[PDB]
Amino acid sequence: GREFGHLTRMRHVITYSLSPFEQRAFPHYFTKGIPNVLRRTRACILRVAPPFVVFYLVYTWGTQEFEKSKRKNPAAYEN
């Protein structure tokens, strides 16, 4: 029963549209797009990135302590 004439109630709202053949498919692309994708990067960088930094530090400590527990023996190797 979810068809287009039966969805919700709406009053006093006007929309304006242009034909696709009357406009250019590529407007401002590097004038608007490059400043837009940079503040989107700034808005999410403090939430996503600090977990993946802690994975990097655990990975380096885990592969380096694996080798000098195994056959890397400078000075604890006496009688």
Next chain:
Amino acid sequence: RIAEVDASVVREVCSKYFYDQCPAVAGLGPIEQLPDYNRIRSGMFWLRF
């Protein structure tokens, strides 16, 4: 002028003014079931002819 109109003249003048043309649309509510402009524009060109 009316007497020189026949069926092939009507087919020629209607194809010049209607066929692959962008229309202008106006609507006043309740118009939630008025189709999208892409579906209206694609209704101007036919499938089998």
